[PDB]
Amino acid sequence: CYRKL
Amino acid sequence: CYRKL
């Protein structure tokens, strides 16, 4: 689970 | 029932 930021 | 005219 990778979240853009 | 009874309905008023």
Place this chain on the structure above:
Amino acid sequence: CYRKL
């Protein structure tokens, strides 16, 4: 409501 004093 009504209040008495």
Place this chain on the structure above:
Amino acid sequence: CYRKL
């Protein structure tokens, strides 16, 4: 819902 203690 107030409790007295």
Place this chain on the structure above:
Amino acid sequence: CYRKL
């Protein structure tokens, strides 16, 4: 185990 306010 999940809450909010």
Place this chain on the structure above:
Amino acid sequence: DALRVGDYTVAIGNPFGLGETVTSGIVSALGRSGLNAENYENFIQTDAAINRGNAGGALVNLNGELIGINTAILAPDGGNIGIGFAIPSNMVKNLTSQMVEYGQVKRGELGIMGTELNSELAKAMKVDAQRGAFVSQVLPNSSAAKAGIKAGDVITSLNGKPISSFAALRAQVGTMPVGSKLTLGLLRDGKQVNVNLELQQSVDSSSIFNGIEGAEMSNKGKDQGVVVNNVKTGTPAAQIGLKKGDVIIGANQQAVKNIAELRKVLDSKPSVLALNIQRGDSTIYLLMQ
């Protein structure tokens, strides 16, 4: 009356019968009322922790002087969640002072009526303050009216001390002896007229009912009998057909011509008691228990 919203409070009591536990907190807010609409509430709110059994416990400031008796909390699960409620010591000192000399409380009476002044009324009534006590009804021949209390005023001061709410001012006064003298600041048309005052008297009959309370009975004439001016229907004293305009002697061969003569023998606890009430010319009877 010196406490402010910010002072530190230390609560004492016995929660869950563990023993004497101490808690620290601050005065959360002042003059809290309304969580039970009937009784006189001027509660000090504290975040000091308080749970079951803390009632009657002391709430004291950092010198250990009693500023309140803790009486209630607010707990949806029955455990302290940061809200404690305490009755101020000045209301407590007053009722401890009435229970010593009299044995009961001399219910004081002013002679006004009112309702909580919101921010709406002051807008149209062109009143300066938003929180106070709007004297709707000024009762006649009362000690209150004797001071020249105007109809349409708002009481905002009590001993030069501002007032949070009516139900607080209502509570602040109901805790006083029948012969005390206090000042009230007003606001009639723009003039803050402060007027001295005194309270005047007020014999309850629900203590003679003991579970069958239905209506209000007093004393008639030169003790011709009890009184039935009350006309209630559907009450605990209604299926037993106590209608208006009918008192007599009394029950179980007892001469009852006043409220006291009735109380002499009713409280001998008889198994069954049967009145003698007479309506018009008709002498009837009427039984209880």
Place this chain on the structure above:
Amino acid sequence: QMPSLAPMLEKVMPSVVSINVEQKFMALGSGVIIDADKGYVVTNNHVVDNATVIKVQLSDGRKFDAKMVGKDPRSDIALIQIQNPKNLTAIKMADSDALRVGDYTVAIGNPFGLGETVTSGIVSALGRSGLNAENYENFIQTDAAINRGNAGGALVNLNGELIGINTAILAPDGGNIGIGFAIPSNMVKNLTSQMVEYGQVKRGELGIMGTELNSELAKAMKVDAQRGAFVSQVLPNSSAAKAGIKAGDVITSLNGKPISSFAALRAQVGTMPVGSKLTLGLLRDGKQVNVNLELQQSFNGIEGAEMSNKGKDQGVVVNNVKTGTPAAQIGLKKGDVIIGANQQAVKNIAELRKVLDSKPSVLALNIQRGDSTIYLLMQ
């Protein structure tokens, strides 16, 4: 002689309020005044959203009326403006970054509607997050009592300076168990002031993708820190790429301040406005990389295609359309030249603007796909 908070609270309670909102529900809550002249109150989005009417009640009794100004459900800050405001008191801001765990805190709100209630505590911790996965949160945690209706309240330090806004609590029973959270002032400052200038929160993002840095990754990749921000891929053509951040980087400091977790930094910069510059502290191959950046977005154009002029008065040219966009759905493709629209011969994008600014329910574009003459239809 006993110390007390009543001197500090005397000056600060005017700046907190109680708010009421009204098939249709009726809401409690608390807000705090930011600007006395204009009557700006800030609160939590979850009390003032789905609001037909907004009724503010000050410390003294005076009810007022407020309208919405902005909203931001992603951080949960929303701003109202009091209508016809007279004699207001603005609370003074504080810089949250000066907070430390162990400091003392005061929580002012309107719990259960009872009235303006004050509760004391300490800074339980900082940088807390992970309770609402899809949310920006850099929460201050306080053991100061906080319950239903205290939301949008004030968390101020012992000097009455606003350090944060009370927001959410963890409580299985529905009553405070000693764990109360708050949004830091500095985030509220960034979110509110954005709603006044722009009306909405315009929060473009630099282009790092990545995930949390755990102590296990410290061993595997020879990284000196156990908590930080790990960079998977940088978006191409984004500021993150242009600045020279590479894959496999570790972010340790934001503007000289250390980072707690990737989820916090994801929130601190989620509230910053578009184009804000900043400096990150990186870690590549266990060596300190300091970078400088500038955030980026997520007439002379249209919904899907880019139109520029060509030649003298001939007409605008669609120079590229991205497939799947609205202007590619209407059929505009690469190279199309618009000479007329709705029987109106067009030259520049300015004669096209006034035609388009009529906002008609239909667009007949007299384009020139190659050598042929066609019409295209939109709306």
Place this chain on the structure above:
Amino acid sequence: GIKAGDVITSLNGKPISSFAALRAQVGTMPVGSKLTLGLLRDGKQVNVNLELQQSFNGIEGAEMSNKGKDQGVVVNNVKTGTPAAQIGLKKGDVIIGANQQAVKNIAELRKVLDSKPSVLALNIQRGDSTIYLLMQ
């Protein structure tokens, strides 16, 4: 002059199909419409004209009867079922002043109720002792 036990057989000369027809056939005539029925009471056709009805300038379920010498409106005997009855109104009240503005007739009373005061905290000598009253 319609009494019980009668039976309606016409409506402006038209025979009638049913009661639900007539119920509709006059639910559409505006208030004050004038019509003439056909009737049957004990074997006699009697023709009766009529006018519809609704279902001093009062306010919110009340009755504002003016008083003399431009002192203020007055009324006694307010019906017990109104929302203007649970306000605390009894039989026998006067008018003098309204929202710190003296009201001396119905025209001064509307010029108070025209500005929509949510407060409506107005009252006068009600009975024989001065008191204050509120509404809304």
